Amino acid sequence: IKELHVKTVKRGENVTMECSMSKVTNKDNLAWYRQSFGKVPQYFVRYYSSNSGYKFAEGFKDSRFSMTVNDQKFDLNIIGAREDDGGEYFCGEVEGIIIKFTSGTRLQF
């Protein structure tokens, strides 16, 4: 089973967590999920038909996050990390009645 990447950062550091695009069946069911410690995971940001390529969960109010979305990349960036960014982030694609996660990162301080 795919091991998570572990990323150790300090307060105020810039970070990118990676997810490859090369093997996505339906770009449209691709998304990053986020799990804070001790909590259930939640849809965070999805691939999206737009100029940016992506759309955060409704009512996510934090412009530190962005993504790099192209033919090859679906990478999540943070400019200026803070303690509450810590947690696990899983990249996955919904396929039928199931989702398959193809990468993830445990971001820690």
Added chain:
Amino acid sequence: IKELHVKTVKRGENVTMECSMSKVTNKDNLAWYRQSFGKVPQYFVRYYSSNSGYKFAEGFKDSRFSMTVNDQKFDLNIIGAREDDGGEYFCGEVEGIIIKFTSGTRLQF
């Protein structure tokens, strides 16, 4: 955010991890996901119309794992716990392009 139930168990013990049928839109879309430490989560067992009511992921063979499924319950059972059962378990329903997790357990030793 929903809190995971934190459960600490002893080797050999029995454990049930609860998930409700009460607000499910489509049962066919309901599944438990399993996450080993430092791994991506993986689909583990889904609702399935049958005498048992469920079907484990292809490749999984461990008869200590079962489910209690009825009109109210979609509960995951372990009979005779083992340390490699350690990890996080999430119950979610795919809803269109996105899975929504409704409950989970942090199973510890």
